[model samples]
Target chain A: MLSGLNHLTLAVSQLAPSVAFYQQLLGMTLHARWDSGAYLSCGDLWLCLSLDPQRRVTPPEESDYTHYAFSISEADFASFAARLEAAGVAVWKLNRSEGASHYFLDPDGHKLELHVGSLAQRLAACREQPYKGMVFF
Target chain B: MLSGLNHLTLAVSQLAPSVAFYQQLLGMTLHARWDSGAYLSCGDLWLCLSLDPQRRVTPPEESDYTHYAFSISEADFASFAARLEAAGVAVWKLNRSEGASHYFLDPDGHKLELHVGSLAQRLAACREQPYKGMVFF
Candidate 1:
């Protein structure tokens, strides 16, 4: 039985820019970098960014609602939004009954989220009014 | 400033089959389900599968060596690989100097790994042999 998720590896269009975005804007600490990929520590999770030369980096035209989200304390929400905005990352506020979240795309058009809530809070919000096609766990 | 990876949501071609693969084959506990997606718990991590009407399930032809791997205890590796093979899932072994791992494709061609090691073990192996383009933590 799989106990927990060990890591999520994303296929990015390039390595260096994606690494910079994650480390600079998202404040992730890069553990190492190679010609093909890089790893970073996010909270207790390992985030791997891999290179895909043939991949396209086009942002989704509509809200696909598929993304990897990270948790941040409520106290840091405002400044966090500012940091993303200052870096020219397009941030859009998503609907939530209580806590707030903004969706943005990484350098390679991979969607990501920054939310200020726990797992329970997120599931509760999904229950109140689920996203267009969100499944609950 | 980041806490940890809260969740990783993937866009599967179909909801029902993906849910079955993740829940039944992978032995993840389903927390909740909606018409379009389902949430499952993998240890402390949350794995979300959302439906994408227009997606393909083709496996990558080349071994890009890019994948999301889950940590498994050495004790469980043999039985786990057997479980996947018994379910008719195609499994392939990759080279590792220390721990063992087998790569498999979900119904949607998303590559996943079952490895008998921790993050530290993985980085160490990378340091020793270093995958085609792997960097270390």
Candidate 2:
């Protein structure tokens, strides 16, 4: 039986820049680093950024709606978006009746989201006016 | 500033079978389901399996080794592997001086791992005799 998610490893074009984006912009703490990859954590969740020169990065428009989302307090939503904009990251907005969500790409063009609500909230909102591609279980 | 990983949503080719694989074989709880995707939970962490026919599935050999891993207690590791085998899933082994890990693919060819230790334990093991691709901060 699976207990909890151990980690999600992503293929990045460069490890150092990706690590910097996560640490400096996203506020994740670096746990370790090697020539081709690094490990960082946001609370208990471990994130691995692995360097892969052959991996092609997909832009937001071409990518599907799948993404990794992080939770933030309702009070911090404004400041969270401000920090990302201050860092000059391209933020894309998606409106949902459940809660507000802002999507952005990491250094490798991997889509990441900052959501102000829980999964249950999102699912409820989705059930009312579901997005074309977004799914909630 | 971040709470933790809210969820990791993956693009899969099929929604129904993927949901069944996760629920039946991996022992994840089905939280909700929609036409295009489904949501499941492993402990507190959420997983989204979304349908995307245009998305490409990479095999283990050509994959960049970007995958999601689940934490399993040492006590449950043996039975976990046994269940996977009984289910007829193809199991791949990656040896680490810290402990043994079993890798496998879901119905969608997305790689997953069952690791038998905590992040701290793995880091400690890596410190003594680091694996070639593993990095510890």
Candidate 3:
């Protein structure tokens, strides 16, 4: 019954800015906009930006490593990172996995990454240089 | 440049059960596994269940509207929801959107959903019966 990741709804305090971050910066297609929320897409991913009333008072969850990442072209990766740097967005960590990537944060402190590898390629890499105790299933 | 969602790395307290949840209950394909993390796939979505050290101490982000969802066939929707409930997973909230959805939690309290709609269907639904002040771009 479960197909795949159909959509991701993010609780954003300021909807417009978050929309801009995803649209103008990430280049996701804008599907719809309304008072309370906006719908955008990238490839097959449906991203919903919803309003959060208590975002200001409620502190962000800390020490968590959860994040969503996007795929990018090797040729376009450099300039894309440049775009993020030009916007004054800061990197949250060093890239430890395969491919060139930039781990960054959003307005709501959501962690996101732009990577240049596919699932198949990652698996191939693992076979050659496996993680500690890595195994096939 | 930016293509689409490449992968999602989730912070899980226990690795094996989360692996079972995705592999057996949700029926995603497990690609690889290791000490710190495991990689699974649903369609083209790469899901990495990573170990979380501070998981015992850090509380999940509260009152946040962030969640990832999966698409399902309308035919299989009810049975899928039944499977989740049968496994003792509780519904987090009632579905307020345009399709049949069961919002539920993972072992680490990460919000997830199973739905019988795609992004295209959702956009079309919005056009036919718009949300309040809905506008297209």
Candidates in order: C-alpha RMSD to true structure: 3.5, 3.1, 2.1
- B1-137 per-residue lDDT for model 2 (tens digits): 88788788888887888889889889999877777778788988788888887656556776556678898888998898888888898644456423667888887667788888776776787788775666555
Cα-based lDDT for every prediction:
0.75, 0.78, 0.84
Q: What's the residue-level lDDT of A110 in candidate 1?
A: 70
lDDT of 2 by residue, A24-135 (tens): 8889988888777777888888887778886666677766656788888888888898888888888654655456677887876778888777767767776787766555
Off by more than 4 A, model 3: A56-61, B56-63
Sort the candidates on TM-score, descending order: 3, 2, 1
Q: If scored against the real structure, what TM-score would every candidate get? A: 0.84, 0.87, 0.94
* iRMS values for every prediction: 3.9, 3.6, 1.4
lDDT, candidate 1, A1-137, per-residue tens:
67777677788887888888888778888887878778788778888787877567665764354578888888887788788888888754465545667677788677788767665776887788776755543
* Model with the higher TM-score, candidate 2 or 3: 3
DockQ of 3: 0.78
Which candidate order results from sorting by lDDT in descending order?
3, 2, 1
Residue A92 accuracy (lDDT) in model 3: 79
For model 2, the local distance difference test gives: 0.78
Candidate 2 chain A: worst-modelled 10 consecutive residues by lDDT:
A91-100
Segments of candidate 1 deviating more than 4 angstroms: A62-65, A91-93, A96-98, A124-137, B62-66, B91-99, B131-137
Worst 10 residues of 1 chain A by lDDT: A91-100
| Model 1 Cα shift for residue A96 (angstroms) | 5.4
Top of the candidates by lDDT: 3
lDDT of 2 at B5: 86
